[PDB]
DNA sequence: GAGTAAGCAGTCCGCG
DNA sequence: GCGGACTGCTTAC
C-alpha cells in the first residue's frame, strides 16, 4: 500500500514523524531535515524556481532548520524578502508525500478516554492535581476495546470491584444499563493503589500509543489532570512518557478573555471532541455538558444518580464506573452519527497538515496553496505584517415589515467561491485597476464598461482571463467535493420524505428493511416495495436515511465552510495571501450581483404579469432574493387550484421553467458587463412558501433585516410530507431564549402562518394560563459568562455590569463557603432567572452553570422567588409583540364595540 | 489567528 | 417611563 503520515513534529534540528509503512505497520523516525528557502535573484541567473509573480528565485539549501531560521532574521535585518515555506514540518510532509495521500483509517490509532477524580473540596483543578485519579476508561479504535482502570483503595474510600453482570442489567432492575453491544468489549482492570494504576496506565499507553486523542473536554480537563498528577507522584520526566517523543509544552492560549494552561503532547494529535463539535456541528447549544449533547444528538436520557458526584464513588461505586464507561461510549456514538473524526482526517491529509491544524482554515489553506504552487516549482511569498483594517461585506435590503402570503426564494450556489472563480481572483492574477463609478451605476448598467480585456469587480480590480490563479484552482477542487456530498445529503433527504409519506399507511406483515443506498434517489421499484413495508421496517429505513443525510451534511457543510473560509481569510492579516483588494473584490461584486438581479427580476415579473414598476422582490441578503408570488397566484386565480400541493407544483414549475432562465439571462449579461473569465452565477430556487390552501394562515412575515418566518412546502427540490417552518433570526432560533419559550413562540408562529389570528389567540391564552407550571430550567434564559472579574467589585455589581454577570455575582454570594457548590467558569454558559423584589439574595437576578440543576441549598429559594411576570414579559410577550405587530395581527382580542353584547 | 451586517437586551443618563 | 448612546451577545449570510 501507499505510505502515509500519522504525526509530525519539529524538535530542534530534528523532524519526528510517526507514519504507516508499505506493509501498513506503525513506525517512527528521527530525520535531520534539510530545509530550503528562496531569495530573488537577477534575471541573468538561470533557475527553475519562480515566485508567484514570475520573478526568478535562488534556492538556499540549509544544513539544518536553525540555519534557515537565522537566515530569515538576517534577511529581515537587511530588508529583503525570505521566500518559501517557513513552517518546516509542512515542507517535510510535502517533500515526503509528494502525491495525493491515500490513507487507511483502520491503521490509525484513535483513542477516546475520560477520567474520574473524587473531590471533597470542590472542582479538582488540573494544574494542582492534588486528588487521586480513581477511574480511567480508555477506548482504543484498533483493538475496539474499552480498557477500564478502576481504583479500589483511596483516601476517600475503599470499594469493592465493579460488576459487569450488574452493569449490564436494566436500571429498573438496579443495574446500570451499560449498552449490550459493548459489554463484550470491556477489559476491566482493578487496582488496590493509585501508583500501580497510573504506572500500568503509562505502560499500556506506550504499547497502544494514541495518534488521534479525543473525548469530552480532554484538552482542558482529562489530559492536563493526568499529566500533572503523574508529574506530582513520579516526576516530570515520567509524565513526559505521555509523549511518544518525550517532549511536552505547558502551553498558553492568547485571545480575548482569560489566561489558562493546557499541555501539548508532542507526537500526538489532540482533537478534543467538544472543539470538533463546536466547529463542525453548526449548532449553538445552551450547554456543552456531555449529558446535554448526548440527549440532543441521540435522544438518550441523562445519566441518573443520587447525591453529588463527590460522594458517588463511595455511595455507589458500581454506578460510578458504569457511568465512566458509558460517557466514553457516548462520544463514540455521537461521532458514529456526525463523523467529525472522519472529516478531520479527510481534510488533514488532503491539505498535508498536522491533523489538529484542521481547526485553522488559514493553516489549512496555506498548506493547500503551498503544495499546489510547489508542484509547478513556484515559490511562495513571505508572510508580512499588516495593520487590521475594517472593510465592507454584503448588502442587505431593508424589508417592509409585514405579512407576506406567498414567497419564492432564490440564492446563488456557493456565492463567494463562485465569485472567486468567475472573476479569477487570486494574488497572482491581478492585472491592474480601473476608475470606479458609484456602485448603483453598475447595478443600473449606466456605468462605462470597466474593461475590454480583463475580468473585473466593481471594486476597481482587474484580473487576467487567460490564466488560472492558484486560489480559483484549489477552491474549485474543494467546491467540487462539496457539490458531490450535498448531492448525497439531498437525495437522502428526499428519500426520507418518501418514507414519511409511506408511514401514513403502514402494512401489517413481518418483513425486513430494504438493502438500499440512501445517497441516491430511490428507484420506482424501490418506491413500490416501500409502499408494502411494515411500520417497523419503514422506521428503520427512515433512521438509516436520516443517518445518511446527517453524514452528507457533515461532509458538505464543512467543505463549504473551508472554501468560504478561503474568501474570509483574504481579509485576515495573518494569512500569507492577505489582500483587501481581493477580499473587497468578492464582497463588492456580491453587492452588485444581488442588487443587479433584483432589478432584473422585478423587470421580468412586471413584464410577464403585464404591469409596470410593481415591487416583486420584497427582501434580500448577501446572495439571496425573496419574491412575493401573490401576483403570480392572483394572475391565474386561487380558485383554479385543487389543493395546496397543486399551487406548490405551479410555482415550482414557474420558478424552474420561467424565472431561473430569466435569472440566468440576467447574470450572463452581468458577466459580459464585467468581462469575467467564466459565468458561474447560478441562482437556483430555494424555498416555496405559503399558507395551506383554504386556510386563514398568513404564509409568512418579516420584522426587519435577518428576521423572518416562512411556512415552507418545498426546499431545494425536497417536497415535504408536512410543511416545515423556516425561521431566521427570531427568538426561537437564539440559544439565549429559554427552551419552553422557543417551543411556545414557534407554536405561535406555526399558528400564525398556517391557521390564522383566532388560532394564535387561543394558544396565547393557554400558554399564559399554564406557564407558571413549567420546570424552572425550561424557562430560564441562557448567556455566555465573559469578563466576570471585570465587574466584580467586592462580590457586588460594578458599573455597566451586564444582567447575566450580576446573576453570577448573586450566585457567588449565595454559595460563599459552600464547599462543593459548582463554580461558574469564565467564558462558559449560564442559566439566568429574574428575582422578585425583597428576595434573600439581595438582587434582581440569579445565574448558575447551564446544563445543571441549581445546587439544592439555594434551589428552594430560587423556586420561591422566581419572577414569573418579568420572565414572561421579557422572553415571550415582547418578542411575540414584535412578530404580531409586524404581521398586522393581534395575539390578544382587542377591545371593540361588540364587547357590549353577550356571546 | 476565515470575513462583515445587523438585530435586541441591558445600563447609564437625561428629562421642570 | 422611554429615547439615545453605549456594550455585550447573538444570529444571518
Ligand atoms: O459562515 C458564513 C456563511 C456565509 N458566508 C458568505 C459566503 C457565502 O458564499 C455567502 C452566502 O451564504 P449562504 O447562502 O449560506 C451560502 P453558500 O452560497 O456558501 O452555499 P450554498 O451553495 O448557498 O449552500 O455568504 C460566509 O462568509 N460565512
Ligand atoms: Ca465524569
Ligand atoms: Ca448561497
Ligand atoms: Ca403501505
Ligand atoms: Ca442565502
Write phi, then psi, for A402 (nearest 5 degrees): -175, 175
Cell numbers at A322, concatenated: 458504569
- Backbone Cα Rg of chain A: 31
**CB A549, CB A489: distance < 8 Å:** yes
**Which distant-in-sequence residues (6+ apart) come within 8 Å of A554 by Cβ?**
A280, A338, A339, A340, A343
Cell of A9: 513534529
Cell 426587519 locates to: A704
CA A300 to chain CA mean position, Å: 22
Whole-Å CA distances, A275 to A341, A358, A359, A554, A819: 11, 11, 8, 15, 30
* Strand C and A734 CB separated by under 7 Å: yes
> Which nucleotide's C1' sits nearest to the alpha carbon of A805?
C8
DSSP A396: B
Ligand 1 atom closest to the Cα of residue A568 is 27
Query: For residue A357, which nucleotide's C1' is closest to its Cα?
Result: B1
Q: Name the pairing type of β-strands A700-704 and A707-715.
A: antiparallel
* Centre of ligand 2 from the C-alpha of residue A162, in Å: 16
- The beta-strand segments (E) located in A477-592 are none
C-alpha cell at A604: 421580468
Scanning the structure block, which residue is given the C-alpha cell 409511506? Answer: A502
- Nucleic strand B within 7 A of Cβ A571: yes
State the number of CA atoms in the 13 A half-sphere of A894 facing the CB.
8
A411 CB below 7 A from strand C atoms: yes
Angle at A895 between CA A890 and CA A896, to 5 degrees: 110
Q: With a 6 A CB cut-off, is A572 part of the ligand 1 pocket?
A: no
CA at A400, C1' at B8: how many angstroms apart?
Answer: 19
A455 — phi, psi (to 5°)?
A: -85, 130
Q: What is the phi/psi pair of residue A27, to 5°? A: -130, 160
C-alpha cell at A519: 445517497
Q: Is A564's C-beta closer than 6 angstroms to any atom of ligand 1?
A: yes
For every residue of A42-80, DSSP letters joined together read -TTS--S-EETTS-BEEEEE-SSHHHHHHHHHHHHHHT-
Displacement of CA A408 from its chain's centroid (Å): 27
Contact (CB, 8 A) for A325 and A146:
yes
Q: Does any strand B atom come closer than 7 Å to the Cβ of A565?
A: yes
Hunting for cell 418506491 — which residue is that?
A527
Neighbours of A125 (CB within 10 A): 14
**Å from CA of A208 to ligand 5 middle:** 47
Is any ligand 1 atom within 6 A of the Cβ of residue A416? yes
Resolution in A: 2.4
A163 CA to middle of ligand 5, Å?
A: 54
Question: Strand runs (DSSP E) across A82-132, as ranges?
Answer: 110-117
Cα separation, A414 vs A248, whole angstroms: 42
Q: Are A760 and A751 in contact (CB under 8 A)?
A: yes
Residues 267-306 of A with CB under 7 A from strand C: 284
Could you check: is the Cβ of residue A783 within 7 Å of any atom of nucleic acid strand C?
Answer: yes
d(CA A147, CA A420): 50
DSSP conformational letter for A357: G
Domains of chain A by start residue, with CATH? 1-108+340-382 (3.30.342.10), 109-339 (3.30.420.10), 383-468+573-729 (3.90.1600.10), 469-572 (1.10.287.690), 730-774+867-889 (1.20.1280.300), 775-866 (3.40.1820.10)
Contacts of A214 (CB under 8 A, 6+ apart): A110, A111, A112, A270, A271, A272, A273, A276, A331, A341
- Is A686 a pocket residue for ligand 1 (Cβ < 6 Å)? no
Q: How many angstroms is C1' of C1 away from CA of A5?
A: 68
Minimum-distance nucleotide, CA of A566 to C1': B2
Specify the residue for cell string 489582500: A579
Residue A269, strand partner residues: A212
- State whether the beta carbon of A354 lies below 7 angstroms from any atom of strand B: no
| A799 Cβ nearer than 7 Å to chain B strand | yes
Q: Is the CB of A414 under 6 A from ligand 1?
A: yes
A490 Cβ closer than 6 Å to some ligand 1 atom: no
Residue nearest to nucleotide C13 (CA to C1'): A622
For residue A349, is it left (φ>0), alpha (ψ between -120 and 50) or beta? Answer: alpha
C-alpha pair distances (Å), A543 with each of A538, A719, A736, A787: 9, 19, 30, 43
CA distance readout (Å), A118 to A209, A226, A393: 27, 14, 51
Does any ligand 1 atom lie closer than 6 A to the CB of residue A274?
no
Q: Three-class SS of residue A431?
A: strand
Do the beta carbons of residue A562 and residue A571 sit within 8 Å? no
Question: Grid coordinates in use for A250?
Answer: 505547558
Cell of A372: 499546489
CA pseudo-torsion sign A625, A631, A636, A641? positive
CA atoms within 13 A on the CB side of A358: 28
The pocket of ion ligand 5, defined by CB under 5 A, consists of A 411, 624
Q: What is the number of alpha carbons within 13 Å of residue A393 lying toward its C-beta?
A: 8
B4: residue with closest CA to C1': A393
CA of A625 to C1' of B5 (A): 16
Name the 3-class secondary structure at A263. Answer: strand
Half-sphere exposure of A327 (CA within 13 A, CB side): 27
CA distance readout (Å), A702 to A595, A624, A665, A678: 19, 15, 29, 35
- Cβ atoms within 10 Å, residue A637: 8
Which positions of chain B lie under 7 Å from any protein Cβ? 1-12
How far, in Å, CA of A363 to CA of A884, rounded? 47
Question: Is the CB of residue A729 below 6 angstroms from any atom belonging to ligand 1?
Answer: no
| Nearest residue (CA) to C1' of C7 | A800
CA A271 to chain centre: 15
A477-CA/B5-C1' distance, Å: 29
Half-sphere exposure of A231 (CA within 13 A, CB side): 17
Ligand 1 center from residue A596 Cα (angstroms): 18
Report the C-alpha gap between A563 and A418 in whole angstroms: 10
Decide whether any atom of ligand 1 lies within 6 Å of the A622 Cβ.
yes
**Cβ-contact A434, A462 below 8 angstroms:** yes
Closest among A337, A353, A272, A269 to A299, alpha carbons compared? A337
Q: How far apart are the first and last CA of chain A?
A: 83
Q: How far is the CA of A413 from the centre of ligand 3 (A)?
A: 5
Query: Which grid cell sits at A598?
Result: 433584483
Tally of CB atoms within 10 A around A711: 26
Q: How far apart are CA A697 and CA A752, in angstroms?
A: 6
Q: What is the 3-state secondary structure (H, E, C) of A145-200?
A: EEEEEEECEECCEECCCCCHHHHCCCHHHCCCCCCHHHHCCEEEEEECCHHHHHHH
Measure the CA–CA gap between A562 and A475, rounded to whole angstroms.
9
Residue A39, CB, strand B, below 7 Å: no
Residue A412 Cβ < 6 Å to ligand 1? yes
- Contact indicator for A318, A163 with CB cutoff of 8 Å: yes
Which SS3 state, helix, strand or coil, does residue A823 take? coil
> What secondary structure letter does DSSP report for A398?
P
Find the ligand nearest to A113 CA: 2
Residue A213 carries which DSSP code? Answer: E
Atom of ligand 1 nearest to the CA of A556: 24
Which positions 377-396 on chain A have a beta carbon less than 7 angstroms from any atom of strand B? Answer: 390-396
Residue A636: left (phi > 0), alpha (psi -120 to 50), or beta?
Answer: alpha
What residues contact A123, with CB distance under 8 A and at least 6 apart? A822, A823
Residues forming a β-bridge with A28: A18
Q: Is A879 helix (H, G, I), strand (E, B) or coil?
A: helix
- Cα–Cα distance for residue pair A619/A726, rounded to 1 Å: 15
Q: Which of residues 574-633 of A touch strand B (CB under 7 A)?
A: 574, 587
H or E element in which residue A113 lies: strand A110-117
What is the distance between the alpha carbons of residues A530 and A509, in angstroms, rounded to a whole number? 13
A25 in Cβ contact with A43 (< 8 Å): no
Other CB atoms within 10 A of residue A740 CB: 19
Rounded distance from Cα A548 to ligand 4 centre (Å)? 23
Cβ atoms of A124 and A117 within 8 Å: the answer is: yes
List all nucleotides in chain C with at least one atom under 7 A from a protein Cβ. Answer: 7-13
Amino acid at each position: 500500500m501507499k505510505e502515509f503520515y500519522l504525526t509530525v513534529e519539529q524538535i530542534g534540528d530534528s523532524i519526528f514523524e510517526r507514519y504507516i509503512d508499505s506493509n501498513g505497520r506503525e513506525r517512527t523516525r528521527e530525520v535531520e531535515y534539510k530545509p530550503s528557502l528562496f531569495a530573488h535573484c537577477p534575471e541573468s541567473q538561470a533557475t527553475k524556481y519562480f515566485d508567484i509573480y514570475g520573478k526568478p528565485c535562488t534556492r538556499k539549501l540549509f544544513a539544518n532548520m536553525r540555519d534557515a531560521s537565522q537566515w530569515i532574521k538576517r534577511m529581515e535585518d537587511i530588508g529583503l524578502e525570505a521566500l518559501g515555506m517557513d513552517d518546516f514540518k509542512l515542507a517535510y510532509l510535502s517533500d515526503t508525500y509528494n502525491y495525493e495521500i491515500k490513507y487507511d483509517h483502520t491503521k490509525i490509532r484513535v483513542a477516546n478516554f475520560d477520567i474520574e477524580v473524587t473531590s471533597p473540596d470542590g472542582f479538582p483543578e488540573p494544574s494542582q492535581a492534588k486528588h487521586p485519579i480513581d477511574a480511567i476508561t480508555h477506548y482504543d479504535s484498533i483493538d475496539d476495546r474499552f480498557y477500564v482502570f478502576d481504583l479500589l483503595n483511596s483516601p476517600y474510600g475503599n470499594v469493592e470491584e465493579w460488576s459487569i453482570e450488574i452493569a449490564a442489567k436494566l436500571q429498573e432492575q438496579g443495574g446500570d444499563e451499560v449498552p449490550s453491544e459493548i459489554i463484550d468489549k470491556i477489559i476491566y482492570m482493578p487496582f488496590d493503589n493509585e501508583k500501580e494504576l497510573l504506572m500500568e496506565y503509562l505502560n499500556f499507553w506506550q504499547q497502544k500509543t494514541p495518534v488521534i486523542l479525543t473525548g469530552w473536554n480532554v484538552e482542558s480537563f482529562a489530559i492536563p489532570y493526568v499529566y500533572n498528577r503523574i508529574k506530582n507522584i513520579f516526576g516530570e520526566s515520567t509524565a513526559k512518557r505521555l509523549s511518544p517523543h518525550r517532549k511536552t509544552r505547558v502551553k498558553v492560549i492568547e485571545n480575548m478573555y482569560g489566561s489558562r494552561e493546557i499541555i501539548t503532547l508532542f507526537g500526538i494529535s489532540v482533537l478534543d471532541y467538544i472543539d470538533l463539535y463546536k466547529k463542525f456541528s453548526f449548532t449553538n447549544q445552551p450547554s456543552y455538558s456531555l449529558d446535554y449533547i448526548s440527549e440532543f444528538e441521540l435522544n438518550v436520557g441523562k445519566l441518573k444518580y443520587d447525591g453529588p458526584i463527590s460522594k458517588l464513588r463511595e455511595s455507589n461505586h458500581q454506578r460510578y464506573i458504569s457511568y465512566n464507561i458509558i460517557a466514553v461510549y457516548r462520544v463514540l456514538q455521537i461521532d458514529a452519527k456526525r463523523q467529525f473524526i472522519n472529516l478531520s482526517l479527510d481534510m488533514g491529509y488532503y491539505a498535508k497538515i498536522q491533523i489538529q491544524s484542521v481547526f485553522s482554515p488559514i493553516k489549512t489553506w496555506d498548506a493547500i496553496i503551498f503544495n499546489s504552487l510547489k508542484e509547478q516549482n513556484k515559490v511562495i511569498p513571505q508572510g508580512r505584517s499588516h495593520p487590521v483594517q475594517p472593510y465592507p461585506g454584503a448588502f442587505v435590503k431593508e424589508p417592509i415589515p409585514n405579512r407576506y402570503k406567498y414567497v419564492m426564494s432564490f440564492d446563488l450556489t456557493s456565492a463567494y467561491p463562485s465569485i472567486i472563480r468567475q472573476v479569477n481572483i487570486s494574488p497572482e492574477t491581478i492585472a491592474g485597476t480601473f476608475k470606479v463609478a458609484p456602485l448603483h451605476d453598475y447595478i443600473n448598467a449606466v456605468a462605462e464598461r470597466p474593461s475590454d480585456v480583463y475580468s473585473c469587480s466593481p471594486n476597481g480590480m482587474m484580473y487576467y482571463k487567460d490564466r488560472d490563479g492558484v486560489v480559483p484552482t484549489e477552491i474549485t477542487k474543494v467546491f467540487n467535493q462539496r457539490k458531490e456530498h450535498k448531492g448525497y445529503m439531498l437525495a437522502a433527504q428526499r428519500n426520507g420524505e418518501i418514507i414519511k409519506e409511506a408511514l401514513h399507511n403502514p402494512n401489517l406483515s413481518v418483513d425486513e428493511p430494504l438493502d438500499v443506498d440512501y445517497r441516491f434517489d430511490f428507484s420506482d421499484e424501490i418506491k413500490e416495495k416501500i409502499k408494502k413495508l411494515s411500520a417497523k421496517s419503514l422506521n428503520e429505513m427512515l433512521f438509516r436515511a436520516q443517518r445518511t443525510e446527517v453524514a452528507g451534511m457533515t461532509a458538505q457543510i464543512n467543505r463549504k465552510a473551508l472554501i468560504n473560509g478561503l474568501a474570509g481569510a483574504l481579509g485576515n492579516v495573518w494569512f500569507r495571501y492577505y489582500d483587501l483588494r481581493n477580499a473587497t473584490a468578492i464582497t463588492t461584486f456580491g453587492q452588485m450581483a444581488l442588487q443587479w438581479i433584483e432589478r432584473k427580476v422585478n423587470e421580468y415579473l412586471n413584464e410577464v404579469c403585464g404591469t409596470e414598476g410593481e415591487a416583486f422582490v420584497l427582501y434580500g441578503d448577501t446572495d439571496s432574493i425573496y419574491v412575493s408570488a401573490d401576483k403570480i397566484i392572483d394572475k391565474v386565480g386561487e380558485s383554479k387550484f385543487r389543493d395546496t400541493n397543486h399551487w406548490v407544483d405551479f410555482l415550482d414549475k414557474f420558478a424552474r421553467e420561467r424565472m431561473e432562465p430569466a435569472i440566468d439571462r440576467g447574470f450572463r449579461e452581468m458577466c459580459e458587463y464585467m468581462n469575467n473569465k467564466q459565468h458561474l452565477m447560478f441562482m437556483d430556487r430555494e424555498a416555496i412558501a405559503g399558507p395551506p390552501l383554504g386556510s386563514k394562515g398568513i404564509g409568512g412575515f418579516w420584522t426587519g433585516k435577518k428576521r423572518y418566518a416562512l411556512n415552507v412546502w418545498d426546499m431545494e427540490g425536497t417536497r415535504y410530507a408536512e410543511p416545515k417552518l423556516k425561521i431566521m433570526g427570531l427568538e426561537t432560533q437564539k440559544s439565549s431564549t429559554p427552551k419552553a419559550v422557543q417551543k411556545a413562540l414557534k407554536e405561535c408562529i406555526r399558528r400564525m402562518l398556517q391557521e390564522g389570528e383566532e388560532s394564535l389567540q387561543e394558544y396565547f391564552k393557554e400558554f399564559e394560563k399554564e406557564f407558571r407550571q413549567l420546570n424552572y430550567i425550561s424557562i430560564a434564559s441562557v448567556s455566555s459568562a465573559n469578563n466576570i472579574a471585570k465587574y466584580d467589585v467586592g462580590g457586588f455589581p460594578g458599573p455597566k455590569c451586564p444582567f447575566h454577570i450580576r446573576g453570577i455575582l448573586t450566585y457567588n454570594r449565595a454559595i460563599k463557603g459552600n464547599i462543593d457548590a459548582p463554580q461558574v467558569v469564565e467564558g462558559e454558559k449560564v442559566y439566568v432567572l429574574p428575582l422578585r423584589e425583597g428576595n434573600p439574595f439581595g438582587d434582581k437576578c440569579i445565574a448558575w452553570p447551564s446544563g445543571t440543576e441549581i445546587t439544592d441549598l439555594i434551589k428552594d429559594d430560587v423556586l420561591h422567588w422566581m419572577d414569573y411576570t418579568v420572565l414572561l414579559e421579557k422572553t415571550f410577550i415582547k418578542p411575540l409583540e414584535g412578530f404580531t405587530s409586524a404581521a398586522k395581527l393581534d395575539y390578544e382580542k382587542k377591545a371593540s364595540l361588540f364587547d357590549m353584547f353577550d356571546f
